[PDB]
UniProtKB/TrEMBL annotation, chain B:
The name this protein goes by in its record: Monooxygenase
Bilayer-crossing regions: none
Binding-site residues for NADP(+), renumbered to this chain: 13, 15-16, 18, 38-40, 64-65, 97, 99, 118, 162, 166, 195
Covered residues, full protein: 401 to 655 of 655
Residues annotated as binding NADPH: 13, 15-16, 18, 38-40, 64-65, 97, 118, 162, 166, 195
Length: 231, 244
């Protein structure tokens, strides 16, 4: 119940869905959580208010992703918030959760170069550059958790553009796990699915991976699909 | 933490190594643990004595695995012990950890029918039949955890006979996950790591008789409620050794 006391976590895209449920659960474990958002401040403030009502600690951090200066702006807000609350800029846990999505999907014949650019800029390139920046603040024993998708393993034509970016995200997991092993920083992919579930079901898996007891899991693909990947 | 208060667990082959470490960690979470052994009673009793010193509850259960009658003998001892302590025969958690291992490499040209039979009898057939019997006692929220091996993903010719049985074990995970999902029972593989000659962690444990506690901490997580959205999965607990 209090496995992350004194750790600092950044959850990208934590104003809603899996990001919100993950911020909530890390904060219940004692983590100070930076609740990153692009522009919905009301939803970010809802996440922070939920955390504070449950007795935890969190603050909102604003940064549009996939645009010039995004990593710099996010880390300026993050470092200022961490320094005010902890006296340090230490980042123990990074969750790459933020993503451009299209729930109604795009037929492959209608995908534009500009859509391919936007999906890539947020869902693959930003996470790579956030990892690169994060490890400058991350001590030995740190955690990087990449939220992927069961779509990397289950063909859905109308989600080809999103799935491409998650294929690229998973390569960050494989290659950076090997790179960061000597520092004892783990890198893992958690794959949600595409019985009624909630965002909390996946967030409980992310929370476990953020703890000390996951130390022997790195470079892994963690199927949190509720068995939807089974066939 | 007390995530497993009032739960009953069986860990096969818990007299040493990953099995002992898993029995210890389930008991620390509040589970009543059946500490199964084939013949090393002294080591099984030391698993149980460690659990009791740490304030938890456990009892030894004897059954040679991979012979006719093995499941029936194990379940007679399990149900008697559970009923004595709790009034019930409910089994919440099964860890299929017991295995015959390639402690020595066997060159593929030297593998015998008898070796193939012994590896399969213990490492694939017994777990299948233990799962079949266990689910008769297992409620909604149950957990079945198959201890596999990174050798199912890393070519080591001298371990081909052992690795075949782990390949079959992983198919129990896939097909039984889908079968038992309507009862809210999850089935998962946890794969310990490997280290001229390449061995897995269970093999290194046997040679010295990838630390057993690090793998057992993963198994313990899978045994808890917070793993409910993971089923049919391969959980890499190789300490990064599957990265190469």
């Amino acid at each position: 119940m209090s496995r992350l006391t004194g750790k600092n976590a950044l959850v990208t895209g934590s104003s809603r869905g899996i990001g919100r449920a993950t911020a909530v659960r890390l904060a219940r474990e004692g983590a100070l959580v930076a609740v990153h958002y692009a522009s919905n401040e009301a939803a970010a403030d809802e996440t922070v208010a939920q955390i504070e009502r449950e007795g935890g600690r969190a603050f909102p951090v604003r940064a549009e992703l996939g645009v010039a200066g995004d990593v710099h702006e996010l880390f300026l807000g993050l470092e200022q918030g961490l320094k005010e609350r902890t006296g340090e800029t230490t980042l123990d846990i990074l969750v790459n959760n933020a993503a451009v999505t299209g729930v109604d999907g795009i037929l492959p014949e209608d995908v534009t170069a500009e859509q391919l650019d936007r999906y890539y800029a947020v869902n693959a390139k930003a996470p790579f550059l956030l990892v690169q920046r994060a490890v400058r603040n991350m001590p030995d024993g740190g955690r990087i958790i990449n939220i992927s998708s069961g779509l990397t393993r289950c063909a859905v034509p109308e989600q080809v553009a999103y799935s491409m970016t998650k294929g690229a995200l998973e390569q960050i997991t494989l290659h950076m796990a090997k790179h960061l092993a000597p520092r004892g920083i783990t890198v893992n992919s958690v794959a949600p699915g595409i019985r009624v579930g909630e965002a909390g079901d996946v967030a409980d898996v992310v929370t476990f991976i953020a703890t000390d007891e996951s130390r022997w899991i790195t470079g892994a693909f963690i199927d949190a699909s509720g068995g939807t990947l089974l066939g």
